[PDB]
Amino acid sequence: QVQLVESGGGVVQPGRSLRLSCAASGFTFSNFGMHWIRQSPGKGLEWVAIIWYDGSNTYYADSVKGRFTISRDNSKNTLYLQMNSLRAEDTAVYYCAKVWFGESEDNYSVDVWGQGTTVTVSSASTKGPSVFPLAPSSKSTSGGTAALGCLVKDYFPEPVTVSWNSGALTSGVHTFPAVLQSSGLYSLSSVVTVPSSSLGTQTYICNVNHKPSNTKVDKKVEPK
Amino acid sequence: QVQLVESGGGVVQPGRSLRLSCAASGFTFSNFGMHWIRQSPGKGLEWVAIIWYDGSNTYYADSVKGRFTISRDNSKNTLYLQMNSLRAEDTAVYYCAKVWFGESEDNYSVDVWGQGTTVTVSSASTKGPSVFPLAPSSKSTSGGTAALGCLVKDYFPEPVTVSWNSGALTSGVHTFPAVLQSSGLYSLSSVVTVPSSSLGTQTYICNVNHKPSNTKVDKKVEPK
Amino acid sequence: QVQLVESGGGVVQPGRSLRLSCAASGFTFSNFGMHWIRQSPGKGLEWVAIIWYDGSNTYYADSVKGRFTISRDNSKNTLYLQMNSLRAEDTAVYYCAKVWFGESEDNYSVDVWGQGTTVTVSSASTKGPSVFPLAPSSKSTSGGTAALGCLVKDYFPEPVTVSWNSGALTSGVHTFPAVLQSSGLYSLSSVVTVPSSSLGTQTYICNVNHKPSNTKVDKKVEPK
Amino acid sequence: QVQLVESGGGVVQPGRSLRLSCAASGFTFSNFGMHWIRQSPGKGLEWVAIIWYDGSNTYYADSVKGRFTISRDNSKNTLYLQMNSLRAEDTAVYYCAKVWFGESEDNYSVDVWGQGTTVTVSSASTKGPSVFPLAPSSKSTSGGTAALGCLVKDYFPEPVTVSWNSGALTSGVHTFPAVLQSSGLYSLSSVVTVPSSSLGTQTYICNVNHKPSNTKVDKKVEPK
Amino acid sequence: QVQLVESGGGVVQPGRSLRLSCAASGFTFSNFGMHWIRQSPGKGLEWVAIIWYDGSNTYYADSVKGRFTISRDNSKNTLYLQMNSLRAEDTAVYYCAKVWFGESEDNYSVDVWGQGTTVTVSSASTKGPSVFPLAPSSKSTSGGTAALGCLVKDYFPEPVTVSWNSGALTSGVHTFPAVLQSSGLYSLSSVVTVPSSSLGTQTYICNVNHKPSNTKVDKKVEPK
Amino acid sequence: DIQMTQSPSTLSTSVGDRVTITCRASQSISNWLAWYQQKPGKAPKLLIYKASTLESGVPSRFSGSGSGTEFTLTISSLQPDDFATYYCQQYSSYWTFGQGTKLEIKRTVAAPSVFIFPPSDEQLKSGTASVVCLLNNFYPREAKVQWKVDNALQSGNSQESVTEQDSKDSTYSLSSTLTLSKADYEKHKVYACEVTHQGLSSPVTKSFNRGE
Amino acid sequence: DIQMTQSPSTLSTSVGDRVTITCRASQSISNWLAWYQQKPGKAPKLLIYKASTLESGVPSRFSGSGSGTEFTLTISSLQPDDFATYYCQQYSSYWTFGQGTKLEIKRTVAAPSVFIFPPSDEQLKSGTASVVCLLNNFYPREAKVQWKVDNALQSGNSQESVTEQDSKDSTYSLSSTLTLSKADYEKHKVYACEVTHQGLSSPVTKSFNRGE
Amino acid sequence: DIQMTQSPSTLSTSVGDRVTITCRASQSISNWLAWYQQKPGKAPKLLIYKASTLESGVPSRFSGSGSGTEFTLTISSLQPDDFATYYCQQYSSYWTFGQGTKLEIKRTVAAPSVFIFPPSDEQLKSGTASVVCLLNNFYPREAKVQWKVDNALQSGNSQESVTEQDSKDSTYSLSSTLTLSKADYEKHKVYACEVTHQGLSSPVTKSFNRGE
Amino acid sequence: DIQMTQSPSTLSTSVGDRVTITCRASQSISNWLAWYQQKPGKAPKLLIYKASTLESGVPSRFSGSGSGTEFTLTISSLQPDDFATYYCQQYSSYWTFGQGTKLEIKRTVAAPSVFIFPPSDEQLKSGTASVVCLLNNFYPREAKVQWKVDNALQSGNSQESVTEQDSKDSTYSLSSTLTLSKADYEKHKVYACEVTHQGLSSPVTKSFNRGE
Amino acid sequence: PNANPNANPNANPNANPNANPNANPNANPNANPNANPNANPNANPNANPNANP
């Protein structure tokens, strides 16, 4: 069926440029107009640009007009978005989308969205995380259930992977989504509830892995 | 931002033709309709013509219907106005203007005006001015202040520049706007108030310059 | 100025179809709605159909609804009226007409009419006329003035021209309008008053011409 | 002439939705407003909704306001009625109707009604009928005339067809209209008067057919 | 059901302008006329303006004629009231209201009122309050009951919130409505009756909050 | 909400008679009243608007009259095509229809033929017992059917159905169905339907014994 | 369908006169009425719209008045170019024209000259017999022509034709044609046309004998 | 052709004042009215559309009001950047602009200084004689200058020119030029210009004698 | 710029329920409205265009309604695959999306289990102090967590994170992280997080002493 | 509720003269599929001046 594959996203410092591409297959790409639409947690879904099938007419959202340039290569079946003068608020997931086929006098929108590519505009430098134990004790025990965890603080960029005991412990694990702090570094926590009767005998180690920095940390969590 | 630059205006004899052009930049020219609007001291602001974004529909004012032809070249981002069979009353400043963006069922007008180009329809031939002194005397003296000037008569076309003592004297200078006479020649005056105690010793010369005829006249004004 | 030229009218047998066209010039045809209005001696002026500037809305008179179809070609600046299943009472002069420009909430009618084209619905076959002399005598003489003429009977279709002495005699000639007979053939008379003292010596010949049948008849009228 | 064809009706469970359509032909549909009017045995004729020719104004009866939505597609010449949150009392025959043409300040109603489509709102499931004999005996004989019949009980939905001897017996047949029972199932009877001297020798079989369930039952009726 | 939401009210200096809006939902807004009605402590209920469903006719009270302009946007379902040259006596709560549906020859008034928005016309500048203690003592004690409070004086504009001991004390609290002083500043008191045996030992603090100035004051009330 | 009311609900008339039906509104509707004709199993057709304007194609024997709150429809000479149901409709404030007046074919009085049918053994095997009382070829339509089970009047457990006027002789037929449980049915012996009609000098009673 | 009616149908007037024609509609058309001028053998030209708005280019001597159902067109001072036919047209509900009012040139009374012509031998050889009665240079237009065959008035077998007003002297000419079969024509002897006109003190009778 | 009219033509105002200008249409234009600001020697800029919608980038001190045929533009507190000419424009039917309202800088009254200049001998040698009357640094702008030649008022042979408000002191200057042929000039003796202004208690008259 | 608004922002519903969400535009968008469904961590999929046209492949339990400025999306019978976020989008003038409505799995109320973790000595040695308050397995999601340091409420120095609904029991977990400098942290003793939830009759307070 | 047959049948001069940004961006399938006789018949100066290769 229709398939769209975005590529080119990543981390870029403010003021620099970035080129997104969208490879189309499963249909005659040169016969359809295309949209670029972005999604951020702060603004939701937000239309960015539209291009005609032949590139003759292009339109842009007011917040990006003059900075973004949409183009296409119908010989390669590829849609392009050149982004210049990036600001912090442009951090979002960008989707390319295909206009549906309709009648000659109707208004048009998109029917098939691409997979999406993440763009992160930040002046933070690549940095590994600090892993601190959230140690269980009597103050974190209610009945036969206790809670312990690992705090993964001050890393950049997303994402990070967390496993427990090399993956042998998955029942009851809650890894919270990361939050962006005022310092531009992300931080999150991963917690697990365990039987209090197992403390001191069962070994619990959280394994944090961060491919962008090649960080691998095995932190042992001991009770107090 | 949006910029419109008119060109092509000048002096034309009645009955001849003239083609004005308007270069647009800063926006997608092919997506907007355009107006030509003229302004004259006798009639004020007066709409001339409108053209659709694709040129399919054009409209003209009744006073110009059948003589003017509005067109556009979207490949060159240029708006054109071919004016034939010009009459004396067509002398005015012509602006191109961009229709604003609105809703589909609204009525439309213009939001951005061009810089404007002056069109002068007259049978007068290019002619340098006659500069005559308006000499101060006892009848033009009240206390320690006297008034003197230069009368710049019978020149065509507009404009002319007047300076005093090569620009060294600017305080108290009043150059009146030119008035068109029954003979089709323009005429104006330039006056300056000077300390009466300087009469007879300080030399005052008015420098009239008329680029269309390459006229440069330095006229000395002597007291009585 | 505004000009409308109808074409396509003629003689058609009942039950057949006919397509009238109206060529417009002197104004932007695509910006105005149009009417077709017919005029017949029996019913006077009678509105037939109206079409919007873009053809989106059409209306028809009750006597023609379901048989006539009005259309337009804005690329050719041509208005069309397809008439099917014609009846005898549809014989009339058909005019196209231009709607005037007015205010948005006013009701509208027509301001400029076309030249008109004649449509004659009859089962009569093309036939040359029969020319009979109206011979003057003592019973058609009062004083010094006598009357003679030519009767042009049983011809189809309209029109026929009558002249006297190849046009040399025009003073006192009265050619009556044609009348439609029960047989579907037209008939008329042409008369002339002459000085009684010229009878028997001056030769009087009526020249009847009927272009549809290429009939030319020169009938000599002698007194009895 | 004017023709309106309703479609979309059927059996729907309470609380579900259903969309009725009305196809118009024989007139300019886009020039007229339309009504939806329903008819039920309990309430008689009951106006439901009205829509303007362009859809700009819509009005609804109080009993349906907020649940029904009337719309139209002038490009398809189709009138629509989306019915949500159906209640038991909405079971009725629904007609679309065309507003008549009148004067500008008159009040308006409908002149041409559609054919009508039946809507039955019930939670009953599709179920074939039970055919029971109405056996003639001495208690159903008066002179030489006897009465026999068939009882068609507990079927849903409407309708069912009843014939006698494959249609060979039609004189004296009375098939009563169906009645709705407390259980939501329909029931009816069909009776026929026959010569008493024919009982025991002439065979009478009633043929019940119920297309919604593809039920075909031939029930033989024997005397007591 | 019918819902009306006013917005736009606030503090405005005399002589300035202010535009109120009323968003309507739950009914066909374009089918009904609307009223603006105001309520003030000095004049009670006072009709302000009325507008027809299509805006063709508007009427105003005599005290506001020539200064207020009522309008509506049926495409946005919004009612507007432009108030110019506001005077001190225009301070009031403004309600939008919907005309009821009735018969053609009846007189009409309103049935559903909006929520209301407060407009305060004053030349006073935004100013935080002065909190003074109303200290209980032997001179304010009768038996086992004493009275204490806080005086919140010379603040602008409304409103202010008063709590006791961060909300821990609510039994017996009386916060008086604010009064407008000759200086244009508001003032009020908050009092509470307490057991006399608790004076000197139980701590009583009034918490005054004024969001327009971001003022938060916790005043301790001590006996004398 | 303007209420509409038509009188009479049913009118028995003959070909050639002068027919007048009335329609009243709960409040003044000026002259904005329309009359619609409907034949059974067929869509309604417009007859009159503005209370007195005849629709194009409608024969002249129809006429309207009335203004304010009282309106009348008159048929000068009834014809066989005019046997139908007539509804009035105000269109002064929204749209409301009257209950409708049905023009009935008047004929001479004909007494009903009464037949009773007991429940079949198959239905008894199914757990239900329906008893059917039939009135055949009677006029006028008004009749009363009372079910008696061991001389005890039944109420709320019967349903009636009436046919339209027969095309050949303009008579009615009526079926009454008394429904009971098998246990209730077997808890009695005699089952009778009593019928009264204006063509009957005395009520007619048909009855059977369970099992007979 | 709104009917329009103009009065008078024909109005005899003179140069310099003040002319007023009226036009009435079967129902209220508000002010949506237009006036059109048509000269013979030429297309109509618009004079007035909205019942009282003068079309651009129309001289000021034309004026309109009226509202509702009665409208008038007034020419303050008639000029020779204004002799034409004037049509009113409502455009409130579709478009319907009146029959038209023709402005006729008033002149002094002139009695007609009457001539009669019998059928030619050639037409009799063709199987038909046409008899022609000619009225020349008469005014006003109203006249009556009666055919008498052996003192018996004819009806339904004659046709009349009238010319327009002569450009030089504003008179009319009329031809009346009696058509008969050769057998009907030869079954009688005397053939007369009798003419009456308001300019004639006595009726004029012309006659001939068949074969003379 | 919809006519537009603005009032007042000129409004003298001061910084901080509340300004209201009006604009009226010859017919109803609904709300399709725009307001444009133009500073001298510069292109116009859009301020308001739909009679009351503020264009993006326009400070909030501008507001529009009005509907039908009367519209107003209000500036709550005038600022020095707002001294310009304001035009209204209907765009309901084609496009027509008003005459424009110029916002003038209000100041105290200052009487003009009057100077007269006779024709130079060189221009007299050239065949023309120009006499110049100068009014310097006056406010307000309204003044009257009458030429008197041997106590005879001149008409149709003079031209006036007025400067804009000076940026430094908000005063006006006016020049009046009387042009005559050498023969007309030498055929008279006394040449005077008389000036009246609201800041002058009595008219000021300057005069010379030809040759004096 | 057309503003879009969806209501409600979050809707708790159960399998088999009838779900209706609304969407409103700041101005009239005719019928040019589309509905998109998005599942978490997945690309959006088109459900409806023209406000009421079902996209090919979409099950019939989805339906659209609305025109002008108010539109609704209705799911007749909710199924587990339909738990996702739904966005409306006007495409009448450019393209703007609503904020989206997330359909949540409704279940019975379950109070949270609360755990607190103090900063490690190693992180304090690193110069930072993070305090973590954990709420486990609660519903609904709405809860309030207040930090109190020596009974003093904190503001502006904490951040919260919430997981999606657990696939097994549809519960939430919430983490609150208080970050402070070592000097601010060591200048106090007691650190508490207080939790209020609709499933708790009384607020729950957890606290520790610094160093204990 | 019907259409006024005498309403304005002309084209509103003060209509929308811009382009509709939401109009059809796709390629029209039933458009002109043939060659254009009056296309460019001259060789292209800036065509490929090298080998294939």
Pairing of the two strands F128-138 and H62-67: unpaired
SS3 F185: helix
Smallest Cα distance from J49 to chain H, Å: 51
Interface touch B104/I27, C-beta < 8 Å: no
CA-nearest residue of chain C to H27? C103
What would the two tokens of residue I164 be?
């999606």
Tell me if H27 and C103 make a contact (CB, 8 A cut-off). Answer: yes
Angle at the Cα of H6 from the Cα atoms of H5 and H10, rounded to 5 degrees: 140
Superfamily of domain G4-105: Immunoglobulins (2.60.40.10)
Please tell me what resolution, in angstroms, this structure has. Answer: 3.4
Beta carbons of G100 and C46 less than 8 angstroms apart: no
- C57 chain-D contacts, CB cut-off 8 A: 28, 30-31
Q: Which of F180, F62, F53 is nearest to F128 (CA)?
A: F180
- Would you call C15 helix, strand, or coil by DSSP? coil
In this complex, the residue of F1, F89, F161 whose CB is nearest that of residue D109 is: F89
Residue G183 host element (H or E): helix G182-186
What pairing do the DSSP bridges indicate for beta strands E11-12 and E117-121? Answer: parallel
Chains C and B touch (3+ CB pairs under 8 A): yes
Tell whether J9 is within 8 A of chain G (Cβ). no
| B-F interface (Cβ pairs under 8 Å ≥ 3) | no
Closest alpha carbon to D99 in D160, D57, D36, D9: D36
The distance of C49 to chain D (nearest Cα, Å) reads 14
Please, are residues F163 and F179 in contact by the beta-carbon 8 Å criterion? no
Architecture of domain I113-209: Sandwich (2.60)
Place of tokens 């149908």: G9
Q: Where are the beta strands (DSSP E) in H150-189?
A: 152-153, 158-162, 172-181
Distance (Å, rounded) from C-alpha F64 to C-alpha F69?
Answer: 14
Q: What is the sign of the dihedral through the CA atoms of B44, B49, B50 and B54?
A: negative
Domains assigned to chain C: 3-121 (2.60.40.10), 130-221 (2.60.40.10)
Chain I hits for J21, Cβ within 8 Å: 93-94
| Alpha-carbon span F39 to F82, nearest angstrom | 9
State the burial class of residue F72 (Cβ atoms within 10 Å of its Cβ: 0-12, 13-18, 19+). middle
Q: Which residues of D touch F195 (CB under 8 A)?
A: none
Among I95, I101, I125, I136, most A C-beta atoms within 10 A, so best to mutate, is: I95
**Whole-number Å distance between alpha carbons of A37 and A24:** 16
- Closest-CA residue in chain I for J20? I93
A83 SS3 class: strand
* Pairing state between β B92-99 and B110-113: antiparallel
Total beta-carbon pairs less than 8 A apart between chain C and chain G: 112
Q: Are C122 and C88 in contact (CB under 8 A)?
A: yes
Q: Nearest Cβ partner of B108 from J11, J15, J21?
A: J15
Q: Is H4 within 8 Å of H94 (Cβ atoms)? A: no
User: Is E15 in contact with H66 (Cβ distance < 8 A)?
Assistant: no
Q: Which of I32, I113, I175 sits opposite A107 (nearest CB)?
A: I32
b/e burial code for range C54-86 (CB count within 10 A of at least 16 → b): eeebbbbbeebeeebebebebeeebbbbebeeb
Nearest-CA neighbor of F58 among F47, F66, F49, F68?
Answer: F47
* H or E stretch at F121: helix F121-126
Q: Do E76 and I28 touch (CB under 8 A)?
A: yes
| Chain H residues touching residue C103 (CB < 8 angstroms) | 27, 93
In this complex, the chains that touch E, judged by 3 or more CB pairs closer than 8 A, are D, F, H, I
Distance CA D66, CA A134 (A): 55
Question: Token pair 């200048």 is at which residue?
Answer: I187
Contacts of D82 in chain I (CB under 8 A): 52, 63, 65
Q: Is H92 on the interface with J (CB under 8 A)?
A: yes
Q: How far apart are CA A114 and CA E46, in angstroms?
A: 59
Report yes or no: H176 and H160 within 8 Å, Cβ to Cβ.
yes
Strand H101-105 and strand H10-13: pairing? parallel
Asked if D139 lies within 8 A of F95 by C-beta distance, the reply is: no
Locate the DSSP E strands across A100-168.
Answer: 110-113, 117-121, 130-134, 141-142, 145-155, 161-164
- Does J2 contact D51 at a Cβ distance shorter than 8 Å? no
Contact E97, E185 (CB under 8 A): no
Q: What residues of chain E lie within 8 A of the CB of H74, using their CB?
A: 17, 84
Closest CA to D48 of E27, F25, F96, I70: F96
Nearest Cα to F199, choosing from F147, F140, F151, F155?
A: F140
- What's the start-to-end Cα distance of chain D, in Å? 57
Nearest chain B residue to J11 by CA: give it: B57
Please report the beta strands in H76-127, taking only residues with DSSP state E, as ranges in sequence order: 85-90, 96-97, 101-105, 113-117
In three-state secondary structure terms, H83 is coil
CB B194 within 8 A of CB B221: no
What is the Cα–Cα distance from C164 to G130, expressed in whole angstroms? Answer: 22
What is the Cα–Cα distance from F61 to F106, expressed in whole angstroms?
20
CATH 2.60.40.10 placement within chain G: 4-105, 113-209
**Residue F140 preceded by cis peptide, ω within 30:** yes
Contact of J16 with chain H, judged by CB distance below 8 Å, is answered with no
Contact criterion met (CB < 8 Å) for H134 and B142: no
Residues in A closer than 8 angstroms to B29, CB to CB, are none
CA distances from I157 to C24, D216, I131, I177, I195 (A): 78, 79, 11, 9, 17
Please tell me whether residue I108 adopts helix, strand or coil conformation: coil
Neighbours of chain G (3+ CB pairs under 8 A): C, D, J
